[PDB]
Design a protein around this nucleic acid. Structure first.
Lengths: 54, 77, 234, 65, 49
RNA sequence: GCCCGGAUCCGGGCACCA
RNA sequence: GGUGCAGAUCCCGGCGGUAGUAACAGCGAAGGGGGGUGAGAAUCCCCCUCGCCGGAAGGGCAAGGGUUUCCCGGCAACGUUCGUCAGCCGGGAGUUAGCCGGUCCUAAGGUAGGGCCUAAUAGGUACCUACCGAAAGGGAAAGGGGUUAACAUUCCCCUGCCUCCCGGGUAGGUGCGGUAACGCAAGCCAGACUCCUGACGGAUUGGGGUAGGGAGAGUAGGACCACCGUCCUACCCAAGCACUCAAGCCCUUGGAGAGCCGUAACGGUGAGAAGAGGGCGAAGGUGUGAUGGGCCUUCCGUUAGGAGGGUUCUCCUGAUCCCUAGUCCCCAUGAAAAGGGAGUCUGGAACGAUCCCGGGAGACCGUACCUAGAACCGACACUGGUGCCCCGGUGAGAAGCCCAAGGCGUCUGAGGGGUAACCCAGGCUAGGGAACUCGGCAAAUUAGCCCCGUAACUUCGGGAGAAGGGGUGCCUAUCGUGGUUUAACAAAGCCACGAUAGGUCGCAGUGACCAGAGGGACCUGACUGUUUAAUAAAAACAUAGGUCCCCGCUAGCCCGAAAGGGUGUGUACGGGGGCUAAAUCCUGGCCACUGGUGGUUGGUUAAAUCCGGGUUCAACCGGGCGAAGCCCCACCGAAGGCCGGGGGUACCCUCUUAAGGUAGCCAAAUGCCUUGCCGGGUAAGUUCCGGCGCGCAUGAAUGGAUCAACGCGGUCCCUACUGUCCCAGCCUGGGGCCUCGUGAACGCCCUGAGCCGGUGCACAGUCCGGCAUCUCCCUACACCGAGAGAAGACCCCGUGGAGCUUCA
RNA sequence: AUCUAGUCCGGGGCAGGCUGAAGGUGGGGGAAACCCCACUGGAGGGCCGAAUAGGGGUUCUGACGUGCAAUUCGUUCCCUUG
């Protein structure tokens, strides 16, 4: 069932672990990629121009 | 960390005068040494989990004694 | 609409790839250039291929697999090359064989491994000779044309009568496709919705148009009978 | 129904009959081509057979040697 | 309990410590009542992995 | 508007942004 | 000028009314007496007793949590009530390894750098090289007894083992036994090649063990003693080392049949059976480890301790744990590596071990605690989810019931009540027995095991536990069959199962518990399976069987912007694409339309090129040549599909547009009229069954007819049974009611709301006319407040959307 | 893609009973082919079956519906060698 019984299976190992470069818990473990700074396939810091309103 | 078939359960009390019971986990038995195409392990050859360092205790004393009996051999000499 | 199943099957995701690590190896002729001799050392089962394979050892110590021929035993001696005789299991050249000789695992060029008549029970006959090439009649009744020095094996692929026993239940066909790439089970296109198939939609399940389609239809439309010349049972 | 009696009343009378005639051909007493009918021949897989006396393995059809 | 030494070997802000104000600071600052604004509880709050 | 075929009309295939 | 608020389902903050009201019951547990601490005890502590779990509420450990662990001291908040208590608050502490795991190996899979591609990369990647990928796969070597408040295969004691390196000897270099299978202290260092463990499915069965559980004898201790003398507790031992082994497979001899040998079963044998000897060989066992412990117990001093006794014997049963062999099955044939051992060769030195003895070394990181009706996720100390592994009587049983070992009365609010009405769960009812109702919904009936007996139908397998009939307790003795014990059979002791004779009691002997109501008829899908997580489990999907289409591999079908890629480690008995839906009996006529395929005298046909005119050059006008497609022709209905009318005497002619509904079936889950007509069943039948066939609008893989078996599918009838009803009554558990503690939410212009007739956008608490009306409180009821809750889903509008389709 | 859908790789499970397919043996018949009976054997997308062994989610249109719970609880049921 969509709600309370299925949230019980959210106690395994997480999808995201700590990242050495940025110190945020955004390193996607299964893909070898930080979803916050790009560490893993970007040498440059992950940055986009939509990342704040103008 | 519960049960796994790659380990056999033992419980011991027959040869036994003290008084308690527990469980020991050992690895399954080995087999006479392996790869395969000719497929016959031998008679008189030894396989143990540890090695008693033996040399002639773990092999017969014929020409090709440890290799195989006179079956898959004479087309090699 | 959405992409069809055959359009998803072309991206080659793990749902549609072949589990080939479970087979003995590629069952092809090796590249050799003499008149050698071999010995059959084993007859094995190849999981998703329908024909058993033999393992051959050459006198210079070369290992390879080829589809087994009906009536060949383990420990038998076979010859390879242009001077090979006409016996079961021998790898010969098609330029040297008379008319009406039954062969299998026929190459098209010299050194491709074998192309035609490889599945279980299938064979080809020698049906003539062009100027530079020999004419071979395949099991589809068509005629193909191959080099003078294309290698072939003498005899019929083992495993005939394969299809004379009914599978008799849906689970006997569940394993069969566990080791193959075929998708099973198969949902009829009339049972889908209009977003997923050109046959879907409607109150009553029916192919809304004639099923025959042209050879020039874009992908996502070639369903039913493809460029048919005829339909009907007779 | 013979050997086909292990299915019960499923699959249809004519479908069970075809299955039964193929199996009765497989389990006939076959004769070894190499030694003779001495040791009986058995199926390893589809197209793979051997005789249990001479230990000779060969390639044949799917349900008969 | 299997810790891969990035949390148990380095100890600090990575699996260590959650503590009240030291008692001598409360006296020194004369504060009416002095709390740690970062206090958490193992059961209610969440610690990042 | 054309070509073309057939008895000015008809047919076939292409031309044609108020 | 950021300039004036009552409204924006306005934003934010504070506060009312409801109201000291609901809730603190339901998911099968329960407390009572005596004493203590404390300012203050239903709730914390001690003793006795009583109740509950006992295949989980007990024991062991993951992922996840992250200090929750242990000691001391507290109670402002925190815990559904209280609290002196705590997973809370303050102060101190706690995790020890050559042998456990990571670390290493590879799996499905991935990445980096090169190449190739990209406008470019933080993009793609078939190829090459390297690396990554498992705390349940593979993977050298440890056990016991003890020790803390909190750690222990990690610390102490005893007894060990692995890998590498030293020193001293020795077996070898230069040695032996056997017909043989084989037996063994056998050299060293540097290579090459090879082989075999590693290293593998499901089903079923025998044999051998072990944990565990029992009976009897004895010695100590305990419990009961109205009378019997029975009942409970303890009695026991690890790894390593020495020795032994059944199955199986091997080695000598031997020489068998119209037969022998052998199994639980299949079976074995001149390609050499039985009989005689032998070789290699599990789990375990027996010694040693160990006058060492740990278990039970007595006495003295009762501080520190000290001094004794026993720890034996004979049997039975027994795994879902362990190892060992058979056999069978597949259009299933059921991982790979590091790391091990051995063999055969080549080169080198004369010193030298895979065997004994002594010595040294073995990084680094994890280790506390919970592992769940309070430590994980769900906003919560959430009846959900996440867990896996294990556990005497009755009995087939890990079921239901009762009880040990262990745990609990914290699924954490209580007290009073001759216990109101009513509600949620349960028991029983005279006479009748479906009269209730859309409908027998719900409830009742039956029920285990042994013997007898069992119809139509049928795909010959089933139906089938069909239907139906009889038996069953207790006591007193027996018999038969089999197991086991150094055990052919017979005796003896234990044990299991199946029967026999007699005696006997009750309303009732499967006495509780557990535990099928049955039969007849039709529709529908063949069957086992799948589905709308959170209103649909089905007749829908799938399926096996059938049939059609594309393609000879540089193919066919599909993905990409390209480099390229999936099917493919594949080859027509195949890969890809449709429709139908097991089997049985069958599958009719039509190629006019649309679509597909092929062909062509011929017509039309773009750019480019060619020719003529024009322009000192062009633009621009013409002509010729003119591919595919289209026009034209033919074929194809298990391609989409379609299967009428008129005139004349079943027959013939004509038009739409080619033909004009064959076999079958029917008022159908398809028939408008319509409750069609006749019969059946009922006292009475719009439903049901049978028959008919004016078929609005049945019909053949768009599948027609057809039901054997199956169904948490739809419907009708009968028997049995009953509180469903006539028609209600009584009893029980938990709430409600009264009291103490905690403590919300919705309605709210206003508090001004008795009602009847009117008025008025046409149904007033408030207006008009009447008739009424002393104030407050408690319980109960929900008729009215066009009661509360949600910018109506219906409907229409807007030159608003979104998804689908095609002849836009 | 910690939920869920499909797949591939490596693992862990399903108390206790019933029916009795092919095959095998021995009687009894008939010259024969072959038939009848008893036993043995252990097949199958067979059958009965554990609140909480595991899986599902039909009935009461039961309780709850400002919940224990943004999908739960009780009864009646369905599956369990593929």
């Amino acid at each position: 069932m969509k709600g309370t019984p299925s949230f019980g299976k959210m106690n395994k190992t997480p999808t995201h672990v700590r990242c050495r470069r940025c110190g945020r818990n955004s390193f996607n473990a299964r893909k070898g990629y930080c979803a916050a700074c790009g560490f893993g396939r970007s040498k440059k810091i992950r940055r986009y121009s939509w990342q704040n309103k103008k | 960390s519960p049960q796994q078939r790659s380990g056999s359960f033992r419980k011991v009390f027959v040869k036994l005068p003290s008084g308690k019971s527990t469980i020991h986990y050992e690895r399954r038995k080995d087999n006479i040494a392996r790869c395969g195409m000719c497929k016959k392990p031998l008679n008189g050859v030894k396989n143990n989990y540890t090695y008693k360092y033996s040399k002639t205790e773990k092999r017969p004393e014929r020409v090709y004694g440890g290799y195989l009996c006179h079956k898959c051999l004479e087309s090699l000499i | 609409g959405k992409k069809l199943l055959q359009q998803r099957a072309g991206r080659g995701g793990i749902n549609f790839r072949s589990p080939s690590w479970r087979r003995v190896g590629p069952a092809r002729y090796p590249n050799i250039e003499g008149d050698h001799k071999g010995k059959i050392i084993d007859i094995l089962h190849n999981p998703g291929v329908t024909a058993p394979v033999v393992k051959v050892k050459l006198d210079n110590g070369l290992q390879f697999y080829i589809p087994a021929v009906q009536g060949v035993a383990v420990g038998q001696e076979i010859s390879i090359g242009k001077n090979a005789t006409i016996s079961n299991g021998n790898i010969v050249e098609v330029g040297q064989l008379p008319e009406g000789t039954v062969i299998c695992n026929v190459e098209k060029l010299k050194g491709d491994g074998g192309k035609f008549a490889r599945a279980a029970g299938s064979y080809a006959v020698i049906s003539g000779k062009a100027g530079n090439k020999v004419l071979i009649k395949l099991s589809s009744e068509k005629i193909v044309e191959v080099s003078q020095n294309a290698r072939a094996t003498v005899g019929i692929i083992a495993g005939g009568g394969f299809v004379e026993k009914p599978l008799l239940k849906a689970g006997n066909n569940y394993w069969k496709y566990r080791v193959r790439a075929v998708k099973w089970p198969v949902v009829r296109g009339v049972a889908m919705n209009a977003v997923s198939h050109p046959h879907g939609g409607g109150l009553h399940q029916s192919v809304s148009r004639p099923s025959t389609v042209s050879r020039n239809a874009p992908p996502g439309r070639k369903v039913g009978h493809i460029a048919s010349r005829r339909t009907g049972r007779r | 129904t013979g050997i086909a009696g292990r299915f019960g009343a499923r699959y249809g009378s004519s479908t069970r009959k075809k299955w039964k005639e193929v199996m009765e051909r497989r389990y006939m007493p076959h004769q070894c081509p190499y030694c003779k009918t001495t040791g009986k021949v058995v199926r390893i897989a589809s197209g793979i057979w051997y005789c249990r006396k001479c230990e000779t393995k060969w390639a044949g059809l799917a349900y008969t040697p | 309990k299997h810790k891969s030494l990035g949390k148990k070997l380095r100890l600090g802000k990575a699996l260590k410590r959650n503590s009240p104000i030291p008692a001598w600071v409360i006296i020194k600052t004369q504060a009416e009542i002095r709390f740690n604004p970062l206090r958490r509880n193992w059961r209610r709050n969440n610690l990042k992995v």
